Amino acid sequence: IVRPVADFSPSLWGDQFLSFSIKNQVAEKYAKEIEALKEQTRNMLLATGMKLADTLNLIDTIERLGISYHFEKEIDDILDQIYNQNSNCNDLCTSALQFRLLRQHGFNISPEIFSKFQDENGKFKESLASDVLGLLNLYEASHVRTHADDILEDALAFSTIHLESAAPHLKSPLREQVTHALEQCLHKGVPRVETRFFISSIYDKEQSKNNVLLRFAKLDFNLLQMLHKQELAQVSRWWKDLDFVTTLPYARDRVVECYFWALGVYFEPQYSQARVMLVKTISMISIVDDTFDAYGTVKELEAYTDAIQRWDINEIDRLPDYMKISYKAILDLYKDYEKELSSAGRSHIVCHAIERMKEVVRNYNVESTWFIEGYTPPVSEYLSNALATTTYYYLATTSYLGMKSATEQDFEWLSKNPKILEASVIICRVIDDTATYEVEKSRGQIATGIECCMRDYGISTKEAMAKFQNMAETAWKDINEGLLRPTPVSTEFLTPILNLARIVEVTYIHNLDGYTHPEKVLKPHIINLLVDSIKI
Ligand SMILES: C/C(=C\COP(=O)(O)OP(=O)(O)O)CC/C=C(\C)CNc1ccccc1
Ligand SMILES: [Mg+2]
Ligand SMILES: [Mg+2]
Ligand SMILES: [Mg+2]
Which one, of 194, 357, 359, 205, lies nearest residue 286 by Cα? Predict the structure, then answer.
């Protein structure tokens, strides 16, 4: 039994994360200052009689600075008051920001707030083309559209063309802020990634910056980063004591990138156990994926799939030796979770993630059977199988395991494949197929996603990759709609699903598999979030 040659890049990190010792001296210093700075900032938020535009800029600034999670209450109370007052008497900049902030927090503010900036056509008044700050906020706001916001259909295109035209002559740091927005809007970016950029490249270089907020943000980011580094060290050690690097060499060695993925789902300290649990799962399912996708014979993947279904160590003897390595590690991982959760009595909930992994595995095997047989399913049939293979139903479910507040009713909701969950699953699928179309139209895979879309609709690779990006746009509208109150579960359990969609957009920016090829895209992110501190 001779197998496809290993062709993956090795982890570019070595063991540079393997051992991080926190400096308690530094950490307690940072924390002590932050407490003072926090209250200073709380009082800024609670100041009486501010103008609407000042309030929205304050909240915007704090959120971009990455310190808003300290003021969920305060910030919500303020937006709720703003929402319930209906202020239709502002300019484009304030209006667009008001719109974006309220929408991001689930307040279904009407898009009619924009009617005053449009002609009798729904086309934005061209006279606004010289109002860069207005354009900039209209641009950002244009990305939180739901299906009901067709009024904003022109906003992205209008804002874009005029931001592009103005950028070269703007002063700094506004120029850099615009250029970066044009490349990566705020709403669909990874929060820590955007925050690092905002703090260092923009806010720190503003003539007008608030020094208390700047300092607060720098200290908080560097403090959490110490936590993240501990987390990664612990996970790196865990991955090293697994040694899949040598025993399962056919697979991608990307546990750092997996941690990046878990960090994107949530960064707050309260989600530390959840990150550690999540990243282990991400890492492990990545191995399973590579075993189906680049090593195991169909006969071998059958025994593997059945053994996953039966879920019981008595099945290892039925498996090839290298498959016993991954299989016992999988079963072990879940007994780990059961125990890690044992003290808070939340052990039972593990079977939700287990069942979702079984489901992923089932569809890995189908996918495999299609490739062997050379089957090109109709797009409907292809999606009904290829949605789960994103692993995203599964990761979403996993992400709840470590959240102390996650009740059974939450998992119950997530199991019914709610529309918000399905939308980010769709985004993952259509982006993965677009990026890795020419990756694996070379590796002999006649069963690619795009290849179904072409044979089915009688359309070219052009129209195929479009009609896919099409579904991505629809899905973002559904995500945005899914955040609106009344929410089906508490917002805390929606943000991970939204964050999962964000990470896919960011990793595959410019249409490249940034996970398999972390070099160009992911490595700079990883350096700025987990290697370099923000110099103070
Ligand atoms: C990275 C991987 C699948 C993508 O690689 P590939 O394009 O070869 O998959 P495919 O066979 O088309 O499903 C899943 C393992 C890593 C995880 C959980 C998070 N990252 C992720 C990235 C893209 C798709 C799904 C998930
Ligand atoms: Mg696969
Ligand atoms: Mg794969
Ligand atoms: Mg693919």
Answer: 357
**Tokens of residue 448, six digits:** 């690619």
Q: Is 332 a catalytic residue?
A: no
Rounded CA-CA distance 242/497 in Å is: 29
How far apart (Å, rounded) are the C-alpha atoms in residues 95 and 137? 8
35 Cβ neighbours under 8 A, 6+ residues apart: none
The active-site residue, picked from 145, 346, 429, 502, is 429
Q: Of these residues, 55, 61, 389, 397, which one is catalytic?
A: 389
> Counting atoms of ligand 1 from 1, which one is nearest the CA of 290?
8
User: Residue 12 burial by CB count (10 A; 0-12/13-18/19+): exposed, middle or buried?
Assistant: middle
Q: Which CATH number, 3.10.580.10, 1.10.600.10, 1.10.510.10, 3.90.226.10, labels domain 5-48+209-535?
A: 1.10.600.10
Q: 224 near 267, Cβ under 8 Å?
A: yes
* Catalytic residue status for 391: yes
| Domain positions in the chain | 5-48+209-535, 49-208
Atom 16 of ligand 1, residue of closest alpha carbon: 286
**292, 178, 210, 204: which is closest to 37 by C-alpha?**
210
Q: Coil, strand, or helix at residue 36?
A: helix
How many CB atoms are located within 10 Å of the residue 246 CB?
6
Identify the experimental approach. X-ray
Specify the DSSP class assigned to residue 92. H
Which residues line the pocket of ligand 1, CB cutoff 6 A? 261, 282, 285-286, 289, 293, 389-391, 395, 428, 432, 436, 515
Structural domain 49-208, CATH architecture? Alpha/alpha barrel (1.50)
State how far the alpha carbon of 384 is from the alpha carbons of 302, 363, 378, in Å: 20, 9, 10
| Cα end-to-end span (Å), the chain | 58
Give the angle subtended at the CA of 401 by the CAs of 400 and 402, to the nearest 5°.
Answer: 95
- Find all residues with CB under 8 Å of 8, minimum gap 6, and list them: 251, 252, 253, 290, 516
Degrees to nearest 5, angle at CA 478 with 475 and 483: 135
Residue numbers in the known binding site for (2E,6E)-farnesyl diphosphate are: 252, 289, 293, 429, 432
CA–centroid distance, residue 296 to ligand 2 (Å) = 11
Distance 432 CA to ligand 4 centre (A): 5
What is the full DSSP assignment across 423-479? HHHHHHHHHHHHHTTTTSTTTT-TT-HHHHHHHHHT--HHHHHHHHHHHHHHHHHHH
- Rounded CA gap, 136 and 92, in Å? 10
Interval between CA 445 and ligand 3 midpoint (Å): 11
